[PDB]
Amino acid sequence: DTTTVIKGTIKTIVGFMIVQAGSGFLVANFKPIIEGLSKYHNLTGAVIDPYTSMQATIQTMADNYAWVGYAVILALFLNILLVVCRRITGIRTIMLTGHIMFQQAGLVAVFYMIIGASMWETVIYTAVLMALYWGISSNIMYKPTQAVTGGAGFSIGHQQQIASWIAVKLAPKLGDKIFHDSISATALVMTVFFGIILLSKTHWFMYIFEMGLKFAVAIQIIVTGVRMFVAELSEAFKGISERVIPNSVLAIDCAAIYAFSPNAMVFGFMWGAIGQFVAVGLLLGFSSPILIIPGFIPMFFSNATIGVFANQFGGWKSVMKICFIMGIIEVLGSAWVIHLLATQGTTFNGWMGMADWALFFPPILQGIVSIPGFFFVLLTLAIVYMVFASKQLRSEEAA
Amino acid sequence: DTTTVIKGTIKTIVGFMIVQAGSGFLVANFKPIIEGLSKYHNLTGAVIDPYTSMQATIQTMADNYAWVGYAVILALFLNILLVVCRRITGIRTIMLTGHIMFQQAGLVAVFYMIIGASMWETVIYTAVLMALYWGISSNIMYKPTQAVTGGAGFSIGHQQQIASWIAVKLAPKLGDKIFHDSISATALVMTVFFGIILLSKTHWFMYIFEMGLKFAVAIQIIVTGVRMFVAELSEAFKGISERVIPNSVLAIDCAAIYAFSPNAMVFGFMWGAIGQFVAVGLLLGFSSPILIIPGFIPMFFSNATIGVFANQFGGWKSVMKICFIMGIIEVLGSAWVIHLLATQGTTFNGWMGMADWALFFPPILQGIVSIPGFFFVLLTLAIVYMVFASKQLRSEEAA
Ligand SMILES: O=C1O[C@H]([C@@H](O)CO)C(O)=C1O
Ligand SMILES: O=C1O[C@H]([C@@H](O)CO)C(O)=C1O
Ligand SMILES: [Ca+2]
Ligand SMILES: [Ca+2]
């Protein structure tokens, strides 16, 4: 092969270069807006979006951003370890989507850096926490994913597995049985939210739409850059998982189940956007020191997947209620995490803003804030799920 | 349509912000290199490349780049008039390649601004020169294109029509009868040119490859932004030419003849890159006040088209001679234009660098600098063609 490895390396470097270009075009049009919030009132000022959080992670991670690559490879190795020993661990699924791994491990690593831990503590803690989150989350969501997909034989590996598990366990008690697309979407989101800020002439509105288009363009360059940056490496992840665990379960993208229920889409994402709208209204009401700018990606994908599971297990009513609560917890939890990051000693402007990154990981990051022994407590919980998963697997294959 | 109009406007705007993104990445990544050429030896420091010259045009024009659009539309209207009156002008061809129009009218307009003319003078003179160059230069290469393409029914509307004419007539006396593709090409070319600069360690060569990759990424973002920004308005131009002159002859991109001769591509580009290497070697040996950085687009495409026509009319021998001399004239003539634009009162670190933009336009800009009446001279020259050409058309319709 050798040569194709060189091709992959050069292509990934080009990817990170495009990420840097989109980051520059994003910064040169928004630093006087947050720094503009300094010479105004309560500073920051944050955007709920995974790619913006990846940008802020890179910029506040410098050349130490390679720790995210070390932690991604190491965490992937630990997940492969959790699948090879599926008999005593009960973990079958494996995480392989590259950009989701780099986003998640990136935010965890930047958390362990804002606190101020060493390099190896960040790589090891990030690897263990991320591997347990992937195997336990997807392996937890395997069965209901089989219920939604009609037994297709794959699980969900994204950023809302635990929230979708709250929808699976809570739904039966509430109901009865890409250029201009993303640019227009996220741009319209920025313009709508800016119009909401107006609730607290054609020239200023034209600058609203133009700010939405500059922001959306920057985010899109970031999207393509990240995708090409993790494309070949994730393809190698499939190359190794292809041979080490050939009969494993794949934790693929959440969108891969949207076609199994295209009805919970616009409605689930609709009430998720309503939840985030109400939550941002509450934030602007209480004069909170943190302003949240919602994004299209976590709304549509997170609240639409939770809309899918809440639809299959609890109909449109469970979609409305549970998805609304999910959006509120998304915005409020993101602002809370940003408060932690600010008090920990670093100015961070982005956050994942998904469902499992503004509901389940805020309490974990707060747990590491409280005690360094909270991590080993999380490991004991991982054994609590692990031994029972082993017993259920043994009593599930032999019976 | 109404809706698709505002849609297309949003599209062109978005494309323009992508252009600004690649531009910011480019100048932000390569400012200290030319500024380093200030604090060392002779300045400039120029890039033979169409998209870089378009970026520098948008830079040295700022909020006055709309004049380029005005001159593009007006020149289009003038060409439409010349084809409507094809009986008394002998003009069959019509240029519709929009991005070539914006590049050419952009450089001519930015020359008519750097010299200090007003808005209406720059728009009028640029529209006239562009209309006469497109209609006359593309109308000249109609029949030889029919001989090369076997009568495929189109002409060539690009950047080397005049050099293709000098090759067509100079040839018979000399012989017997796209992401990582462009990024890889231009990156390799930057590494080669930097290797020739070294003709005057792993960290140094790896940073050569990294600077070439950054420049390639910036140039590629500029490419996508230009194509998107132009696609809609050029599609409107084609929509008007569909109904005003349906039976007209289309002057299309030059590469559409490469399929009729895939052999002259790598050899014409071979001796063209050789000519660029020799001429740049002369600019380094003579200690010229202007350094020249070659680009992949001018070499490959200019010397490729000239290699195809000079191949059809004068074999591999005329390919070697005319392509080599054409490359030398490319480098030396472009650096010439950079010298004149330097004395005229501004700095311009990059030129179109194609065949006709280093052989035919340097003397035009020099003549306009000397006396403005020279412009009127060209106008009279057009009549010396048009009138004559007029009769020819009749002598080829009824005879
Ligand atoms: O969290 C994310 O969701 C989308 C996509 O993976 C969903 O299909 C994306 O690009 C992310 O970073
Ligand atoms: O001048 C140019 O030549 C190439 C292409 O048109 C040749 O096919 C390109 O992208 C330009 O902008
Ligand atoms: Ca490969
Ligand atoms: Ca169209």
Numbering used by the authors:
A (entry chain B), B (entry chain A): 37 to 213, 228 to 250, 262 to 460
Article, verbatim:
The phosphoenolpyruvate (PEP)-dependent sugar phosphotransferase system (PTS), which catalyzes PEP-dependent group translocation, is used by bacteria for sugar uptake where the source of energy is from phosphoenolpyruvate. The PTS includes an integral membrane transporter protein IIC, an enzyme IIB-like protein and an enzyme IIA-like protein forming an enzyme II (EII) complex, each of which is sugar specific. UlaA, UlaB and UlaC are the components of the l-ascorbate PTS EII complex, involve in the uptake of vitamin C and its phosphorylation to l-ascorbate 6-phosphate. EIIC proteins are thought to use the elevator mechanism, an implementation of the alternate access mechanism, to transport sugars across the membrane.
